[PDB]
Amino acid sequence: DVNANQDPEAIKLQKSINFEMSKLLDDFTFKFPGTTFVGSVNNIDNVPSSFRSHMRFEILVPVPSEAQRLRIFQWYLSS
Amino acid sequence: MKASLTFSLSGIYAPCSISRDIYLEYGDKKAECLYGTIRLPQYGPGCTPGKIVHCVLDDSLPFCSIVVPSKLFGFMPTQPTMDFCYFEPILDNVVPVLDSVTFLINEQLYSKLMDLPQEMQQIQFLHYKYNINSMETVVHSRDILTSGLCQILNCSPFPQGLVDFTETQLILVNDTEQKLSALKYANEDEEYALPKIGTNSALSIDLESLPCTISRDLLRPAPHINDDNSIYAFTDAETLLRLDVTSGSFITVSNMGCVRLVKLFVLLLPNGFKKRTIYAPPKIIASFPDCSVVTISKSNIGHTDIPIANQVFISRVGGWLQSQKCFQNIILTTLKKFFSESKRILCQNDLIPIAFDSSMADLNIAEENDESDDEDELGQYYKNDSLVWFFVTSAELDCFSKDNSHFIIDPNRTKLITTNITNRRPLPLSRSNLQRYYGFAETFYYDLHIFPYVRQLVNILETSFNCSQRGITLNASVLLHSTTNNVGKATMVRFASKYLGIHLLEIDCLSLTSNSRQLDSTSKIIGYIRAKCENVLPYASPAVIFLAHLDSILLDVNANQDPEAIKLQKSINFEMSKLLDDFTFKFPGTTFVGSVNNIDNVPSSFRSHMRFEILVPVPSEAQRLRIFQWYLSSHELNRDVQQKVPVSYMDNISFSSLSSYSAGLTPLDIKSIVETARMTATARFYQESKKCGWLPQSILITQEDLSKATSKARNEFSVSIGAPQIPNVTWDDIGGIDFVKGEILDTIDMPLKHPELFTSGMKKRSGILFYGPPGTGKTLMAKAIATNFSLNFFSVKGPELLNMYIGESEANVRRVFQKAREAKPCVIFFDQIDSVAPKRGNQGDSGGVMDRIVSQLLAELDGMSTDADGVFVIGATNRPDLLDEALLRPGRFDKLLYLGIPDTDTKQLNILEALTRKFVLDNDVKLIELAKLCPFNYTGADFYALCSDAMLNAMSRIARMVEKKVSQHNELTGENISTRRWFDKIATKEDTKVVVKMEDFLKAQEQLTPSVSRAELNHYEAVRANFEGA
Amino acid sequence: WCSFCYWYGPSLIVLDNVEALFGKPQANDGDPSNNGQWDNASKLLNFFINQVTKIFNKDNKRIRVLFSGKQKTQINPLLFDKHFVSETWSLRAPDKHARAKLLEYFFSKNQIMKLNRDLQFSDLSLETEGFSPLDLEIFTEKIFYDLQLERDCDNVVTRELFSKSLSAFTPSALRGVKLTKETNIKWGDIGALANAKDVLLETLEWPTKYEPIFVNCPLRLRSGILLYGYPGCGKTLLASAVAQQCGLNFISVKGPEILNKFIGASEQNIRELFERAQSVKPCILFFDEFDSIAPKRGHDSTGVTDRVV
Amino acid sequence: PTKYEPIFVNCPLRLRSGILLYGYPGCGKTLLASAVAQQCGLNFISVKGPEILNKFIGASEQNIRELFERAQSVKPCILFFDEFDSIAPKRGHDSTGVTDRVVNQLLTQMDGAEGLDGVYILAATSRPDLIDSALLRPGRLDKSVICNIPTESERLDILQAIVNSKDKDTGQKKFALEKNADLKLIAEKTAGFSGADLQGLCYNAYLKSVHRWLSAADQSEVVPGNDNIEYFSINEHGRREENRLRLKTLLQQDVVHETKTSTSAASELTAVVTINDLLEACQETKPSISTSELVKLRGIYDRFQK
Ligand SMILES: Nc1ncnc2c1ncn2[C@@H]1O[C@H](COP(=O)(O)OP(=O)(O)OP(=O)(O)O)[C@@H](O)[C@H]1O
Ligand SMILES: Nc1ncnc2c1ncn2[C@@H]1O[C@H](COP(=O)(O)OP(=O)(O)OP(=O)(O)O)[C@@H](O)[C@H]1O
Ligand SMILES: Nc1ncnc2c1ncn2[C@@H]1O[C@H](COP(=O)(O)OP(=O)(O)OP(=O)(O)O)[C@@H](O)[C@H]1O
Ligand SMILES: Nc1ncnc2c1ncn2[C@@H]1O[C@H](COP(=O)(O)OP(=O)(O)O)[C@@H](O)[C@H]1O
Ligand SMILES: [Mg+2]
Ligand SMILES: [Mg+2]
Ligand SMILES: [Mg+2]
């Protein structure tokens, strides 16, 4: 995220990196056939708006419920 | 089209005769009467509008020639004329008609015609005397009908149009002063004496600068190819044949200094310049500073002998433009252009001006023409921008005596070389105007008598210059500091440079490339400044070194910054002082002229050491008028525009009214308004031109466009200072009011105009307080005053001023008033002022916040009692007794207005009429009965409520109308349109016209109780019983 | 840039996202005294203005400039000080017809999708009213994926498909706010006051629906309505419904919330509402419990209530 | 202490200093203070009411201290509090907010151990006894000076002053006096409103009078005669008044400069107010009326009992 309260000449690198990364996004998507770009993020809000919009259909991954736990215990305790 | 021209004596508006050909290919055989457009070349960069003239055939005239009456331009054909003119066919032979033409007429014939008992006699006398025929004679504006008898004052609405008594008033106006007798349309009839002297001796005449560049076409003798271009000179007087040498000969004496060869021509008919003077180009005039009048005589040399000098070592004058690194290239290229194209006469010890364009410098063209097909890449793309001089510096060695005078630099037999840089003074403004001649960005021509600060500065510069001649020296140093941006300090300095010829070294601390914080960059900033100065200064003649926006560098000491930054800033702070000292010491005349935008920021180490501080104010009434007169002048609007049609303005606009409107505007604002007006005019013209045809002569500024532009610029500035967007309201939107209008005029209007009376200020009327009953047009009155009087508007919206802390509300009050004071012509509107300034010592303490509020307000409002006028405070309340007594005394809230319910039938009807503006009463119902319906108990807001109820009823009616109408096309049985956008189907928008009827007003009167209780009116009458001052 | 455009005759320089280079690094309520924020970039802007004004004074057709930034105000105020620019063309959020007009194009842009049977996007625009021309492309791709993953239909969209895809997606604007409100849409409740509810419906909607005629209105439109009622006989629910008609946005205050004991906030909280309302769009600005704000025509005590009113 | 300085620099006892001005509003207090500057030639630091107070706790302290330190940096200086009630009210028997800070600061800076010198604190307000008694202690603000609005039969002296005021030396007058100058009649007629009332009368009468020279009853300066109708009998169209006004504006294309005239009795371009007509302004201007203030002034000067 743009912490615009930070000192100038740092936020300028922030803009640079954000935009240039998105540039590579588009470049890969359009220059090559079959690029998909899966991303993973530790907390969604921190992805800047300038970049958040581009992607589509983000997935929330909730923690497993007891029905999932039943299968993962059987996985670790497997033969 | 181009054709030959000839002049003849004839009536004021006799039809012009044209040759057989012009008539054939331009005269439409179906036209009952032929018309055309005629244009005259002039000594100037622009072109005047063309005269639309009746035309007749004349086979006697030769191929493509036209004869026109001299009186069409006030000329006499008994003196040298032009050989050609321009013609344009009439667009479909369509000619407009005028409405309110005006003729001035002398007292004698005016009175004589006045005693006559019949009116058509004057109409017939028009034809009898001036050969005018109705519906056929085209008249022109400002034309003198006959010298000493009568003159045309205006044409309207078009400057040119047909005369039709059924349409034109032809207003004869008495010339009581009888100045038309002195206003001869022609210059004169004869010279002082025909014989004069058989062999006239050398004569002393005034050598003055030609105010424009000449066109090579309009020279009576035909000049020989590729020679003598740079030594043209012009004159009109009898002197050309006083000396036996004919036109196109040479003259040399030129004050009997080092004689400068120059060629003299004849000035032609329309030229309005002064007689018995020699008009010279910059080159000739640059050699003669001062010595206004110079001796001149004939020089029958026979030919320009000795056209070959082996070499010539030219040199470079010292100046700011010359010494720049980047420009070093283009100059030499333009010099190589200067050579090998024509035979140029170079009298040694003389200047050579060379024009170029700065913006092209960093770019370049190839050597293509040098390689082959040597030609100039047409200068039509190279608009000359900057000027630099060069000096001959060479009396070349050759096998002849006095060969340094009147030689030529042959393209192939001679080569020029550069020696070094030299030093001289340029010309002062009053001596000549290089920018005008070359059409550069003309720096404003102040009039010292009306701009104190430019005079105060020029006095310092002139005294410094004169001291420079003395043996003694003193360190002149000036610092221009101003309250707000865009007040022309750099224009000030540049004008000061011109008016005295002081060289200008222009360095802007913005442009210098070192980083703002100048981290480890002292040697960068100061190396750059030091180099750019010392490269030019030692060879510079007495020079002003101008530091634009010096504040950028000279930052103040920072109390909240890292020590290293503070130390490196102190370093430059000290070294700038040291640099000023050393430069002041090194050479005489060096004048340090810095500029800042806020004096308080300059450090003490520099604030004290500096000598002179000049406060440059926002221009006053007397000044903005001049600024307007400048930016609407012909030579400044045509400059930016290569389009064929010239621009100009209807003379009926009153500069004074504009100046009144333009209060509080900076000069840049004025240029903005002017250019926006030019927008509106041009757009109007181009939009309208698609019609059949009219108004082709020129695209004209008009007063309404200028006023609209003012309205725009006002609000845009007001947005810049954060004001609210006051809606458009005018006096027409208020009614029931007679005396309070007079009061508000006496308070605001009277001091605005006629400033000569309130010379000392006298602490003019200060406070308008609208008390009395509620809901009666107070906020309306305020927004009206705001919109109408051309004042910025600031508003304090009730108890908004309070806050959640100690003191910060007093910060609020001081900040609002500060913001008011920094836009001096302003109004501060207090609405519900009882909330902010309640009575002190009552209703408990509650921490005393309200007391500290009213104390701060009381102390700021007009406590300081000095120059606080120019900002007016207007307040309104439900009840005054809430207001503290200390605000009631005159000088704070002096004029109390009992604006309230009308209580009288006529005033009620007046309110109806006023609110009927833009309303759609279009019926036999009359406001008389409508007033009779509603008793006086109804309020001022009441009739607005009634009007709105009527409007809403009309909307309901039309709504059901539209619904049942579209129910005939939207239903399935019709199946026509179901877009729910039926106004496309109902394209007859007039069908939608809502109009009120007695149904509406009757029901409203039925369904609209008075919005003030008998109890409420009684209570506010009681409040009135607290009748202030008793 | 100035050299090239000067040589190439009548020409434009157009700068996208200009704030990235000429934008002011805003002061963050820092010190104004150090010449404000006369940073490197305001300096560059001033340089550019000078250098272009130089050419522009020579011939006005030879150059023009075309800036573009998120919002007008936040571009460097030096532009509006030196009077370098005066134009107010703003790309408003497309509404109603616009939505449909370009939805089709997206549907046929690169993929070739077929609309559901017997429709012409008529109500496809009615929903997703706040979507931007960025949101619409994403929505189209969303629909594409949703129908494609079904494996039984790959040619035509369906109403239930659109209903499913409409959830789990939000407009870019207000995407990150994560705010859920006004789920209480109950327009269907006729209520008992339908006899005169039409008057309210009129005064809120008709001035907008019959747009062309009201352009000719020379008098300020009736705009305020007040409603008594025996305690709580449906009042907030009615307000909610009249909000959910959606011709206007809605925000509301409940009277006892704002009557702080603190002198300043007590009045400042009213301005807090207007400052936001005026900043967005036409709004209802509903006062619930308005009795508690009203001052009972008090003039003697001059309590804070008087200040608020 | 500066005009006759060799004599007044004789004693060691600290020069009697500080003045508190009090009495009716609009009676020349802020004037009388702000006029001292050029009359004496001292510096005049200005404190435009409660500028010192600040939202932060103790910022007012750093403000007052810096104020006095500034005053001590450049010396001597008059130090004028344009009002002295809202700053430093009478200390209550409790916290009473931040005011008890500022008060106890001002006392410290006034007569602290490291006592300043060469600074003259000049205070004014309408209601002074709400200043803390420890600020009225002689040695600080020690001389209390009443000003009075009634001055029956002395209002002539003020009137004559204000009318004869010549502040702008460019002209030998600003107000347009008349020859008789029987100011006694109006002075008596004033009924003793205030001190600013008379300036208000002056300006009001000048307003009512200026219409004579400018408006001229739309007959004495505009449309004065021969030049009323120089156009001919208009019959082509009904435009009669606006037409002639437009023609008059158009014909006034002449240019002049320094068009001075002194048709007035002893003034340039003005219509001197006839004091008889000036009598018409007495019934409009208003006083500020309060007996509470009269009673209240019983107290500040030793309650007229002690
Ligand atoms: N009085 C004036 N008359 C005519 N033109 C003016 C005047 N004042 C300013 N201008 C014009 O305004 C423009 C900018 O003026 P200038 O560069 O002198 O401003 P400045 O005083 O240095 O301002 P700032 O400190 O805001 O940069 C120029 O085009 C100049 O011709
Ligand atoms: N006498 C009148 N003439 C013209 N318009 C009027 C008149 N009375 C009312 N109006 C119209 O009705 C509106 C209502 O008046 P407005 O609210 O401005 O009055 P007010 O006296 O300032 O009231 P308040 O102080 O109670 O807010 C005005 O803005 C104006 O449009
Ligand atoms: N000699 C004078 N006596 C009285 N008033 C005078 C005199 N000369 C000028 N005036 C004018 O009369 C008014 C007197 O105002 P004054 O100085 O009493 O205000 P103030 O002290 O700020 O009042 P307040 O007590 O309301 O805060 C001013 O408008 C002033 O210009
Ligand atoms: N006609 C109705 N239809 C549905 N609910 C209603 C109706 N009338 C009243 N209510 C209910 O009464 C309440 C109406 O809101 P409101 O009058 O603001 O309640 P309160 O005034 O107690 O806050 C809601 O709980 C709503 O569900
Ligand atoms: Mg400048
Ligand atoms: Mg109002
Ligand atoms: Mg005072």
Numbering used by the authors:
A (entry chain F): 556 to 634
B (entry chain D): 1 to 1030
C (entry chain E): 510 to 818
D (entry chain C): 716 to 1021
Please give the exact wording used by the authors of the publication that reports this structure.
The double-ring AAA+ ATPase Pex1/Pex6 is required for peroxisomal receptor recycling and is essential for peroxisome formation. Pex1 and Pex6 are both composed of two N-terminal domains (N1 and N2) followed by two AAA cassettes, known as the D1 and D2 domains. Pex1/Pex6 is the only known double-ring heterohexamer of the type II AAA+ family, with both subunits capped by a unique pair of N-terminal domains. We used a Pex6 Walker B mutant (E832Q) and “trapped” the heterohexamer processing an endogenous substrate along the central channel formed by the active D2 ring.
In this conformation, the D1 ring is symmetric and all ATPase domains of the D1 ring are bound to ATP. The resulting central pore of the D1 ring has a diameter of approximately 15 Å. The substrate is threaded into a right-handed spiral staircase formed by pore loops 1 of Pex1(D2) and Pex6(D2). The pore loops 1 of chain A (Pex1) and E (Pex1) occupy the highest and the lowest position of the spiral (grey highlight in 3d). D2 of chain F (Pex6) does not directly contact the substrate and does not follow the spiral arrangement (“seam” subunit). We therefore define this conformation of the heterohexamer as the “single-seam” state. The aromatic residue (Pex1 F771; Pex6 Y805) and the isoleucine of the involved pore loops 1 bind to the substrate every two amino acids in a “forceps”-like manner. We therefore measured the buried surface area between adjacent protomers and distances between Walker A and arginine-fingers of the associated protomers. In line with these observations, our analysis suggests that both the “bottom” Pex1(D) and the disengaged “seam” Pex1(F) D2 domains are indeed in an ADP-bound state. In Pex1/Pex6 “single-seam” state, however, the D2 domains are organized as tight dimers and this signal is not passed on to the directly neighboring subunit, but two subunits further.
